[PDB]
Design a protein around this ligand. Sequence first.
Ligand code: NAG
Ligand code: NAG
Lengths: 50, 42
Amino acid sequence: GTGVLTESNKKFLPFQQFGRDIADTTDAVRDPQTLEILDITPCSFGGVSV
Amino acid sequence: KIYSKHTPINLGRDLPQGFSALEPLVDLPIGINITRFQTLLA
Ligand SMILES: *[C@@H]1O[C@H](CO)[C@@H](O)[C@H](O)[C@H]1NC(C)=O
Ligand SMILES: *[C@@H]1O[C@H](CO)[C@@H](O)[C@H](O)[C@H]1NC(C)=O
């Protein structure tokens, strides 16, 4: 994927590895190495009108 | 798949009234056929 990884205060239970949105898109992951909880946000975007 | 929960209740009215989810602490790749089960006592 593509996005910004941020430190999150989400409380994963120890067995959980992922976290998804309403549209079944992942918004939180667990680091396989350091066991960190990383929130994933899409990069900055927006409509442009002339 | 084994799910466990330890809920210290105070009423003691057999199974209590309420909600308590169970978490998958144990999963074993046993691959066997299970039809009958029994418990163990000391
Ligand atoms: C894998 O990386 C983690 C984090 O650095 C470390 O704690 C762990 O010991 C490593 N495992 C091996 C097999 O080197
Ligand atoms: C397990 O054994 C029973 C016989 O008691 C059989 O009917 C069944 O097909 C076997 N396999 C299962 C339950 O997957």
